[PDB]
Design a binder for this molecule. Structure first.
Ligand SMILES: NC(=O)c1ccc[n+]([C@@H]2O[C@H](COP(=O)([O-])OP(=O)(O)OC[C@H]3O[C@@H](n4cnc5c(N)ncnc54)[C@H](OP(=O)(O)O)[C@@H]3O)[C@@H](O)[C@H]2O)c1
Ligand SMILES: O=C(O)COc1cc(Cl)ccc1C(=O)NCc1c(F)c(F)c(Br)c(F)c1F
Ligand SMILES: O=C(O)COc1cc(Cl)ccc1C(=O)NCc1c(F)c(F)c(Br)c(F)c1F
Length: 316
């Protein structure tokens, strides 16, 4: 049902995908089955979500029942930064691929640019809650990830939560084999990412917008925090099209050629979230939405600026 954004590899990445962070076991399998039924072909996964085994089961079912073919699915996962040491990249990946019950991933991403203390404690922190770093860097990880592409286990690599400085650091690495095909970052009307999107596109890098609905269920949300779904100015535009706020928030990215990955385990909403190809936001509506930028991050809670390669303090 989705249109696509063409990658530099010429592969076609479906422009709407299904997010899976915080999708509980017992619900994420049904969420994936409903999404594939509703036309979704892009599923966004990660090691750290600890639910890939259930996503894998759902994907397998639907393949078994002729609902869809593997080659028409676009499956993305992410390498967590406790596994940046070369040998751990492979092991972490093997776990992700075994859990997803697949023979290859369409895209494998660096989840976050800063290396953490290596190993299977996923959230190494000091007594205050500050991240504990490791010596292996995202360039060390990328080296190991490039092997996976050589071997055909992964069709393309990308990054997530990179600023243009980290992308430059990657693109400018001498001896680079594969370039990233996408940069997955938070993006919505309160964080429009104009300069970052401009930069990525100019380098042949697509952008995938995460938390496009402002992630209203994030555990750290405070009642005073901005709420996109309840924003009267967003709802105004949705009303004009007899659509929902969520549909507007999703359509916003599609019209910027930015891939978008809203999360839901609610069947009605999973369906709602992909009914975004039967309307168009006007230029005036797009301009108004863009004007809502307040450089605001729903995902900005973690304490890690004390380590090298912190992405969020640069201008873009
Ligand atoms: N790379 C990264 O660092 C990173 C960071 C954050 C997220 N992500 C990815 O991006 C995905 C999406 O971001 P997100 O999960 O933070 O938040 P989000 O997609 O902006 O919002 C998800 C929340 O909105 C609800 N929802 C979904 N559709 C709705 C609708 N039509 N109307 C009202 N509410 C709706 C969902 O509820 P129900 O599920 O209960 O329906 C869920 O509580 C994640 O799942 C993950 O795959 C990546
Ligand atoms: O994980 C949970 O169930 C709840 O965890 C929290 C709840 C609150 Cl209110 C604040 C912070 C956390 C937290 O730091 N979690 C570890 C944690 C991350 F650090 C991270 F970056 C990713 Br991505 C994760 F997936 C992940 F789980
Ligand atoms: O990744 C997802 O899909 C969900 O994201 C989260 C979930 C939880 Cl429980 C806690 C934090 C996040 C989150 O902030 N993630 C982006 C992210 C990191 F991953 C990270 F390691 C550092 Br450090 C960051 F500062 C940060 F911004």
């Amino acid at each position: 049902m989705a249109t696509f954004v063409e990658l530099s590899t010429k592969a076609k990445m479906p422009i709407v995908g299904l997010g899976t962070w915080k999708s509980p076991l017992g619900k994420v399998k049904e969420a994936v089955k409903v999404a594939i039924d509703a036309g979704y072909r892009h599923i966004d996964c990660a090691y750290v979500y600890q639910n890939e085994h259930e996503v894998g089961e759902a994907i397998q079912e639907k393949i078994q029942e002729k609902a869809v073919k593997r080659e028409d699915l676009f499956i993305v996962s992410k390498l967590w930064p406790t596994f940046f040491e070369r040998p751990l990249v492979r092991k972490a990946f093997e776990k992700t691929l075994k859990d997803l019950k697949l023979s290859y991933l369409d895209v494998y991403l660096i989840h976050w640019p800063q290396g953490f203390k290596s190993g299977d404690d996923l959230f190494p922190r000091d007594d205050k809650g500050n991240a504990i770093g490791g010596k292996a860097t995202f360039l060390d990880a990328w080296e190991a990830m490039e092997e996976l592409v050589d071997e055909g286990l992964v069709k393309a690599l990308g990054v997530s939560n990179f600023s243009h400085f980290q992308i430059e650091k990657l693109l400018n690495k001498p001896g680079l084999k594969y370039k990233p095909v996408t940069n997955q970052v938070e993006c919505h009307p309160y964080l429009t990412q104009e300069k970052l999107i401009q930069y990525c596109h100019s380098k042949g890098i697509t952008v995938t917008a995460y938390s496009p609905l402002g992630s209203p269920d994030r555990p750290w949300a405070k009642p005073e925090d901005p709420s996109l779904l309840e924003d009267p100015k967003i709802k105004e535009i949705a009303a004009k099209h007899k659509k929902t706020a969520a549909q507007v928030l999703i359509r916003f990215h599609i019209q910027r050629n930015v891939i978008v990955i809203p999360k839901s385990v609610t069947p009605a909403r999973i369906v709602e979230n992909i009914q975004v190809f039967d309307f168009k936001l006007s230029d005036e509506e797009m301009a108004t939405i863009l004007s809502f930028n307040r450089n605001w991050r729903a995902c900005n809670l973690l304490q890690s600026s004390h380590l090298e390669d912190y992405p969020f303090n640069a201008e873009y």
